């Protein structure tokens, strides 16, 4: 049935520097209009399983 305990980041503004860690879960804004912390039009949760 699947094990969904393991996640990965799919969206970020820029590439990471070497050996850093990004555990923030702020909603990535793909568009020009902001979205104030809800998922929806051009705004995605940045972690997938």
């Amino acid at each position: 049935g699947g094990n969904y305990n393991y996640l990965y980041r799919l969206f970020r503004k820029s590439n990471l520097k070497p050996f850093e860690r990004d555990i923030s879960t702020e909603i990535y804004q793909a568009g020009s209009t902001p979205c104030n912390g809800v998922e929806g039009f051009n705004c995605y949760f940045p972690l997938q399983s």
């Binding site: 020009s32 209009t33 809800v38 929806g40 039009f41």
Partner: protein, 211 residues
């Protein structure tokens, strides 16, 4: 909602413009403005994407632009068959998704017509029936952007009136009708009523007085 003028037409092989003139925070404060097309009976078809883009198909006569809070469409060359409704659309703030109002776009190859108006007061049997209805009929007015206003002795009225959308006849012009609901005591209260119709700036009105 957004605003677009409900009637715009011109000669075949020319350029007609259509304005969408929304407010800020949906059209001025964004960039995702689209334009659709609905032939009378079919589903809408995406005609212009964001600001000024096109899908495949869509022959290059249609163009779009945005100049602040007003985006506009322009058709350059009416072939014969681009009669549609042309809803503009925008993404508003909070996933809202607002729409427009729709503009009929005809192409009277000949000369405009005059909306023949005819008005009828409530019959006698209806007076005995404890009710009253005024009947305003409009006919033969080629370009279909008619609108109507109802008048008691001196003032306008906005309650008890129903208005048909324009319907095409055999001669390929239009016709419409409107009804006014009245209690007979209000029918004899005011000394006369009238139905006025406006059409391409022009206006014609008819009037009837109780007996």
């Amino acid at each position: 909602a957004l605003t677009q003028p409900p009637s715009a037409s011109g000669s075949p092989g020319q350029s007609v413009t259509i304005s969408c003139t929304g407010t800020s925070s949906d059209v001025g404060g964004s960039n995702y403005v689209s334009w659709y097309q609905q032939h009378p009976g079919k589903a809408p078809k995406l005609m212009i994407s964001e600001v000024s883009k096109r899908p495949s198909g869509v022959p290059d006569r249609f163009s779009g632009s945005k100049s602040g809070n007003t985006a506009s469409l322009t058709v350059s060359g009416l072939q014969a068959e681009d009669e549609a409704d042309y809803y503009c659309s925008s993404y508003a703030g909070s996933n809202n998704w607002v729409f427009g109002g729709g503009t009929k776009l005809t192409v009277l190859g000949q000369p405009k017509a005059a909306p023949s108006v005819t008005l009828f007061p409530p019959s006698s049997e209806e007076l005995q029936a404890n009710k009253a209805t005024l009947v305003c009929l409009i006919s033969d007015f080629y370009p279909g952007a008619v609108t109507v206003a109802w008048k008691g002795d001196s003032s306008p009225v906005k309650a008890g009136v129903e208005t048909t959308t324009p319907s095409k006849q055999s001669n390929n012009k239009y016709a419409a009708s409107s009804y006014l609901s009245l209690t007979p005591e209000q029918w004899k209260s005011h000394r006369s009523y009238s139905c006025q119709v406006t059409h391409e700036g022009s206006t014609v009105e008819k009037t009837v007085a109780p007996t």
